[model samples]
Target chain A: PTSCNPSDMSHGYVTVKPRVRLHFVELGSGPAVCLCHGFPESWYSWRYQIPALAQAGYRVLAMDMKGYGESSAPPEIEEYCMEVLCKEMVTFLDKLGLSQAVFIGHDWGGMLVWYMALFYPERVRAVASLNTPFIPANPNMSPLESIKANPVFDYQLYFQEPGVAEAELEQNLSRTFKSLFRASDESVLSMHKVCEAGGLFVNSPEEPSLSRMVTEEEIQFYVQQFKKSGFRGPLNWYRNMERNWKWACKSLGRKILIPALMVTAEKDFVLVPQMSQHMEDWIPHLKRGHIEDCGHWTQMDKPTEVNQILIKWLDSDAR
Target chain B: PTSCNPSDMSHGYVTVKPRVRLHFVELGSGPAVCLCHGFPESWYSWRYQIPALAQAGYRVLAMDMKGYGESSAPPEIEEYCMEVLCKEMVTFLDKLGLSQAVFIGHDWGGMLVWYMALFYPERVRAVASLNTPFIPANPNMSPLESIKANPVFDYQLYFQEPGVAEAELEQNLSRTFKSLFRASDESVLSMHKVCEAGGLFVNSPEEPSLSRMVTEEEIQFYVQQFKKSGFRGPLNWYRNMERNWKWACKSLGRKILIPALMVTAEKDFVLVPQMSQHMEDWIPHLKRGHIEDCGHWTQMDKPTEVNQILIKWLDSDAR
Candidate 1:
């Protein structure tokens, strides 16, 4: 039997180690679904999808990934490495007594789920990723080196540096969350604004009315999580990109054997439309969709469509 | 070409009769889709569906039916009759210079859309309704008699009385709005409660948690409109049921020829699940869906699923 607080519907924390306890909110009971949220976001990122999946008969568990939200934050930069972080998910399930589970992820959470499916295939039943795409290991180059080759991923460089983004984000948590979690066409015309503006946001003469994507109450939840756990733990995830790259070499040339679903956001800045074609080459069992008029925050920006696609995939004999 | 303040994307009123003006809020442009709200609700009832239909390539107009919201209210009971109310919709469209529109409604609004399709078919390109069903009038009986025969609709009797419900409801605007707009199973178990409470709400020891069906801002919007318009105008709608029954007799045995959609709420109080089976006998071109876990306020209670069904039905060439 899994070691989870089955009675609590809202939230509960489980101690995985003397130094680590991960907080999660769960719904229902059946085949487990381990939900992973992306960089700078906590379990709250999966708020809209949780109830839908649980009602459909899956024990949905949305957790504050190790370095974010209410999870145990390890201060050492090395502790945030991919090899170490990926195991946290494995034990997260082991704590619940589940030997296998379906994994769903968005943003950084998406990338981590892809890694989980790759590194520990035995533990993952099926995988669904939104916005983020999988890139096979570059035997000759580190992730930072490959990213430096393109101006599109330049934002990563800003995040990689310590204290630079931490100061900008932590100083004004509300502004940071608001600006990042928004709806956009993710067009090329908006590319210059992403860089020319001092940071991620700028006062463009023309800005689409911030999609009432999420309510003020939803925004406040993100703010509360970030305020409780400062920016350092999250930023540390980016700080370990080189370590993540080194770990990637182990899965070189390997194809994902598990059933997979990739929901590509048409206007995503980080995961461009063209990446879908590249993803097809690596994921043989992958089913893909390009959601039009959506941005990087695919789950929040277009929740209904996302939920439909996810529920259909979950119901299918994907496993 | 129609005269309109196209630039405004919010609520405004138009003179539909020498003595009556219909207020409506609209969005986008192209083919127009007219929206009618239920008894005791203003244009705000279609609040969640308006922007969705508008964005999906229609000039969406959600209107405050006669005697509601900012629209002109007639004091005479005869003025609220269906013959007068139905013509108001025809003129409301004529005033907008639209030859045809996809007509959408809920509750009393749902019944109106059905009447419009039967009486003014050319004006309604398609019709969609939430919760309310099409009940062909019994040749020998008035609506009150038909309603009295079924305990499910017995509450309408209290509403039809001139001063009784108005005094009960008008005494407390907030409580009245809250009690009416809630999500319930309408099970045989709870059916007694709606009446036994002396009204729709009761301080029962075993009441299902009222679904957070609408936000505080939404609730405030309802409170403000009812506060301004008063309960008399809305209650006038119920007072004219006998007239509506007689008027419905004009189209005896007429089948609704237009393509139609009926989204039945599983937990709706008056419009029970069995009503859908009864409706198919009259609405041949109807596409139907039973939204589970939803009550009378189907559109607001489960906006996403309701929107999906509506948008898909609207887009299909079912008509």
Candidate 2:
């Protein structure tokens, strides 16, 4: 079977709030599986899953979140806080005339879907996170303090300074995306070195080779999207660590009551598979899966394996 | 005695954080009393208080906050969050070679002083807020939700949306400042009506008359300051209600251990005298003062009365 072509998908915009619009691509017709993408990426990241899930008798909707792709990227940082971001998701579902949907997210979007389960449980049927796991806010130290204490999270500290990160990323969008979207063993090591250096491109190669998982055309799409939206909005997600920590505190003593799936990648260095081990303590209805020899881009790196696990989980637990 | 001259004061800049600098005017040479000004105002708003406090043998440092006149107004809203604002205040003190100082604030500045007492008690010797009182975060509802519930806070709702309020306020700086800086009975009423209308200048007159409390030159100075900085950074403070609420929640059950003073304005419609009534419940060593027939601009509208109470409190309690 031929792979899904984005040109064939139905794309539209929905007003989530005043001066805020979300753009999404729709496919198939059945139970809705809303796809949430990660940082430095867009709705197009879920291209592999969209048609697969749609053909499996599930309606697929992948959205360019408020600060990504074609969605509204508000100029204010407060607009990108967790409370507003969660509200926008619920409002997006409202505008679509859908009561609820199973949310599947990767990386930053993974964190959001888990937050969706905590903040607005009624609007989320189930959640499946790839690579990124649901680690509840630490009560002892704030997310920012924890980041500062750890060398792996130094890139977040770099992103906290408003214009600095934006200038570096926007200086060469193609190089930035090429350096980020990779699945090789050395690619993960290079990313960790960059993170340790407290900058995205500090350790990046001058002429980085493209990942086998993502075609040159796919890289071009991301480059075009970043060119339109810029890095300020996407980087804002990292700046809200303390705000998100405080927000997460509101859900203290609460556990995720919905069916949850965490798909971990073996070769994902930053968001290691071990991070998802203790999730069962917080998520009562939890199902864990692992992809061997996979990298941070779990879905793209092993779409067949991911699709198998997701479909099986949907049939057995999610539905 | 002649009032303090703007040209005579020692004007300088201090880099609080990278890409963030605060501008302040210093006077006197005794105990430091840092003045924090409020919305639609600058360090010039404290023009009346600086000389009075300085002449009373107290060193007065009135700062144009990170978003106000002569200060580095960063383009991002997160830079204006409560945590950063509080840190900037502490850093400002650090740069000035002082470990701690008494923070006195009015209107929005009043809110910051109270937050200073909570967030960084060690950096604050004492705090005195005029026309704004310490109210703990409502455990039942967030600050934004509370604002949405109360029509008196509708203007804040308007300010929450970026670009809209900036457009209206920047349209005519003279009229905007004239419409806001008043102490008349009708002025308070008109301000309330405008708040209820969810706009700043909705109920304002075409050519609003200036308050007798400020000189023509003082109004011109305010217009010039706002023209330089713009309303975006100032309005960002209002946008951070929910974030401030979340941050405040971290200090649950914590009392203001520092010596504090709450000065109320009887005729201040929004921040009325009644709001400061329960402040003593949270502030253990609290002093209360009231100015009859005063508006929100407590320090400016009744400088002699405010100075009398503040000086007495500083001598007897804050020292």
Candidate 3:
């Protein structure tokens, strides 16, 4: 018999705070492991890991983060700041009666989890991240200023504007997802080209096929999720760069004392492997894992290998 | 016969750089005193001062800055940066065969003149400003961050978006000018109210009458000017805060060695007297002037007092 159908996991909603409810799927009943998904994604991103982690004698809670699936996507950009999001996660744990749990995150979620580790260390047992790395705050320049200085990340600059990115992405939901979810080997999308095209997906093909990593069913799921939520809430994440930078500054020189794992994909262009080179300096008990020839969607690009890395770290260092 | 009509001053255009031309109203013939006007205004802003300074025996060159009136307003936001603007002013002097000149400015122009004093000190003789003061660079936070942290400057945050402010201000030119050019006592237009109203002048009256300081003829002239130039170029000045801050850092603790004048309006809410309180700290040779019961539009609100202050400083410290 199959371990369990990931698609048929038990779904529930918890009001993490007033007017801020979070939707999540649960499976198994053991030591808890919470999964935080990223931008242009939902709880479904952890489909492969949720069942495997649960079957390995661990409780798996994969959440649709605020502004994604069925979660509360607040209208104000200020609501998406790192301080608010980190507090929300801690309160979310309080409501679930879990004193502490291992948090695994990817992309933007990866960034958020690191922040949680820094800001709410008491609520975090350990942490694992896919693709994104924890960048220490610059004593000199803020994140927004740094991004503005660099041309390659002009896409983030484009996202800073309110209606510009939303108008472009929402105009073609299917195209937007298909454009973003591609494997590194599949045409290698350029952030500069995306910005030069004047919109996020304007450079993408009209009938772009699914990435080898993502199924047609999964693509449809994302398209539906984004259709309901729209791009405004998701894009608000990018708008809080300066606010997050300032919040991060308060914890400058703070280290992640808990066990940590950083999984880097070889072919991920935006969050290059070099970004994680100094992770050990900030996270002393860090376990480094690398997936050869994989892309940005680390867990999806090579699920079996990703699961092995996570389980090995969880069984050894995370204990 | 009346002195040369301020409205009909001699108009001339000079190619300051390649594809960059400046329009100015010239009068008198002596040591040059270039007047740089500010946002939502042109050389027309210095109408009262142009003839007065000329009558005082100084050649007055009141210019329509790069983004206003008949001057060349480049489409790119980067083109409006402080570096480019400072260089353009130097080039403007180069083309006019003046080695150096006294610079007089008000409002946004006031800010630009201070930058000119710092960045291109050689090109500036005595410098004078109205409403705006020279704010030193914060080694820690950039100007944009400082502004973002303050709620009072939310209108500036609203202006950072590309199309939002243009769409709002251009919808009705008359209301936009009337809303902005009002005296302090006419109706204290709150920056917070303007932001909450969802657009610049939405909080303003639909049929906003002219401020007592500005005439119907003057209002009509402004309406004609904005109709041609639009607000995009003017609003871009706000977009370069961080960039300007970065550029300003290179000259940290740089003093204005030349004679300097700061004119404050008693009733101006935005650029209040407190802003200029510490001008003497940065400008070694500084002169201070104040107009009682005047507002942000210092020159237009009380032209005779402004002219007297400018001429007195010009005769004494400026000489």
Candidate 3 lDDT (Cα, 0 to 1): 0.80
Q: Residue A129 lDDT in model 1? A: 91
lDDT of 1: 0.73
Model 1 spans > 4 angstroms off: A1-8, A185-198, A202-210, B1-319
Candidate 2 off by > 4 Å: A1-319, B186-189, B192-198
Better candidate number, 1 or 3, judged by TM-score = 3
Residue pairs in collision within model 3? none
Report the C-alpha lDDT of model 1 over A1-319, residue by residue, as the tens digit.
0122222233445556568777776554446688888888878777678767766666677888887877889788887787887897787665443568899988888889999999999989999999888888887877888877787777777777777777867876666666667777422233333445666544532322334676666777778888876888888878887778878987897888888999888778767867767776787888876699898877777777887888888889443
Model 3 residue runs over 4 Å out of place are: A1-319, B1-7
How many backbone overlaps does candidate 1 show? 1
Clashing pairs in 1: A2-A96
**What is the fnat of candidate 3?**
0.00
lDDT of 1 at B167: 78
Q: Write the per-residue lDDT of candidate 3 for residues A102-169, one digit (tens) a residue.
A: 99999999999999898888888899999999889996897877886777688998888889889888
Candidate 1 vs 3: which has more lDDT: 3
Q: lDDT (CA) for every model shown?
A: 0.73, 0.80, 0.80
